[PDB]
Every structure is written in C-alpha cells, then in structure tokens.
Amino acid sequence: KLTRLGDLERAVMDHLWSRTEPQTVRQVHEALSARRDLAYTTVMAVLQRLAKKNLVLQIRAHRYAPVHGRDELVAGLMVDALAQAEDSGSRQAALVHFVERVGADEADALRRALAELEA
Amino acid sequence: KLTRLGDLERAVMDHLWSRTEPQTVRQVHEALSARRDLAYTTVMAVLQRLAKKNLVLQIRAHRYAPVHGRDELVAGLMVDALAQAEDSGSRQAALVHFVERVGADEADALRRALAELEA
Ligand SMILES: [Cl-]
Ligand SMILES: [Cl-]
Ligand SMILES: [Cl-]
The missing domain is CATH 6.10.140.850 (Helix Hairpins)
Structure with missing residues (x-):
C-alpha cells in the first residue's frame, strides 16, 4: 500500500486533481513542463505506476482519472x-x-x- | 520518531512490543535470529542506541522495555x-x-x- 507520494507522482496527481476531465499523457506532460523537462515516456511510466497503485484509472486516445x-x-x-x-x-x-x-x-x-x- | 526507525531498530522494537515482560539482550538476539544472522554485540549496541533515544529503558538480569x-x-x-x-x-x-x-x-x-x- 502507498503511504506517501513521490514528488513526480504528486506533480502528476496535482494536475489531475485540477481538471474535471480525464487527461492524456500529452496533457499531463504539458502541465509538468511548467517546472520540469521530462521525457514523454517518463510521464507515461509514472501514470502507469500510479495506476498500479490504484491512484488513477486509465480510461479508453488514453486518458487518466484520479481514483x-x-x-x-x-x-x-x-x-x-x-x-x-x-x-x-x-x-x-x-x-x-x-x-x-x-x-x-x-x-x-x-x-x-x-x-x-x-x- | 517511531515511524522513522532504521530497519534493525524497528525489528528490535517489534520484538519488544510482542512481549509483555522486558526482554534480555539474549532474548532480543534469539528473536531476530530467525530472519538475520547478527552478532550479539550488534543487538546489544542497537538496544543501547535505542535507550539513548529514549525508546527503550534498561531495567535492572539486564532487560529492556519499550518506552x-x-x-x-x-x-x-x-x-x-x-x-x-x-x-x-x-x-x-x-x-x-x-x-x-x-x-x-x-x-x-x-x-x-x-x-x-x-x-
Ligand atoms: Cl525524464
Ligand atoms: Cl498496535
Ligand atoms: Cl552483525
């Protein structure tokens, strides 16, 4: 069980919590680009790990919603x-x-x- | 902070919490020996350090009780x-x-x- 979020997991859920609509990897990446230069695959990978932790759901053009x-x-x-x-x-x-x-x-x-x- | 204990500190505290009576260094060492091979002095030394942190109290047989x-x-x-x-x-x-x-x-x-x- 998760007990704390890492700084990138938190950056991520922070974007997701700021939007009513589920968000694409591209949308999360664009939000995170405000402070960080990350690879698209890094943002993708962190979304997937957060899904494995049941903190987001992958919706299907893939989008992610906070659980x-x-x-x-x-x-x-x-x-x-x-x-x-x-x-x-x-x-x-x-x-x-x-x-x-x-x-x-x-x-x-x-x-x-x-x-x-x-x- | 109990939440910030090192792994060996936690293993010790676990043993002590599992037992009603204060425990000797030997009793702690025997208990930890199921999952680790540690020197007697290593256990004794971690009990000493826990004591300095006020997380255990030495009771005078020398035994240790969780604070x-x-x-x-x-x-x-x-x-x-x-x-x-x-x-x-x-x-x-x-x-x-x-x-x-x-x-x-x-x-x-x-x-x-x-x-x-x-x-
Ligand atoms: Cl990266
Ligand atoms: Cl408890
Ligand atoms: Cl050792």
Whole structure:
C-alpha cells in the first residue's frame, strides 16, 4: 500500500486533481513542463505506476482519472494507518495519542465532524 | 520518531512490543535470529542506541522495555498521513472525511480521545 507520494507522482496527481476531465499523457506532460523537462515516456511510466497503485484509472486516445480526490486520498491514508493497530485497545490508545499530536483547529475539526456525524 | 526507525531498530522494537515482560539482550538476539544472522554485540549496541533515544529503558538480569507502545507507532503513521495534505484547507477537509470514513466504534473511540484531550 502507498503511504506517501513521490514528488513526480504528486506533480502528476496535482494536475489531475485540477481538471474535471480525464487527461492524456500529452496533457499531463504539458502541465509538468511548467517546472520540469521530462521525457514523454517518463510521464507515461509514472501514470502507469500510479495506476498500479490504484491512484488513477486509465480510461479508453488514453486518458487518466484520479481514483481519489486530494482530500479523500489523505483521509484514506489515515484509515490505512489506523488499520495497522493490532486490536480495539491499541486503536483506542492510538487515537488518544493522535489527537494529542494534531493542532486545536484540527482537534476541533474532528469534534465538529463527529457532532455532525451523529446529530 | 517511531515511524522513522532504521530497519534493525524497528525489528528490535517489534520484538519488544510482542512481549509483555522486558526482554534480555539474549532474548532480543534469539528473536531476530530467525530472519538475520547478527552478532550479539550488534543487538546489544542497537538496544543501547535505542535507550539513548529514549525508546527503550534498561531495567535492572539486564532487560529492556519499550518506552512507547506500538499504539504510538500507529498514532505516528496517522500523523504522517495527515502530513501528506498540501495545506491547512486540505488538512481540515481530510479530517472531516476521516471521521466520515471510520466505523462507529472508532468514532466513539475518537470521541473518547478528544474528551481526554479536553480534560
Ligand atoms: Cl525524464
Ligand atoms: Cl498496535
Ligand atoms: Cl552483525
């Protein structure tokens, strides 16, 4: 399971997350050319690796769509992380330590969301 | 950071987390020997370095107990995940999604964690 994106994978998903339509290799390459000089095959290859990581889907003139949005990807990584805990006791303790390590704004965002979740 | 441990440091911490009682250098060495051929001094030395990092405590038989439990590794993995967010806006939206994604038992665990933080 992916736990972080490399800088080129991130450049890539950043373009994809900025467009509603699935994008061709050529379109991603043109976006990345703003800061990098890359081979077309390098952009192609990174798309394919991101597809193998289920972060994009190849649509068929091949186009690529992000499987998760920017925010939902982060949320999913957090879920994947909590899933590492061995049992409900350590999930509980993990969550205690987790909220100690986020900011207040973050802790409150959690509080607000939880209160909406139920009521 | 538990999430940033070297591979041998992690192998040791894994063993210690797997056992209720503090473990001798011999016990750690025997446990690691299933997957590696290491010198006794190598294990002893990594325990010493972990101790200087405050990740284990030597208990006087000389034995070693983990200072932080594996639930703190899980919390760290969550912190690292949240850190993948590109800015505060995305950071807050990901937490909302997280709360939306978790099970009810986890939400309730989260509620308990935030109450403790609150106290
Ligand atoms: Cl290249
Ligand atoms: Cl755990
Ligand atoms: Cl060795």
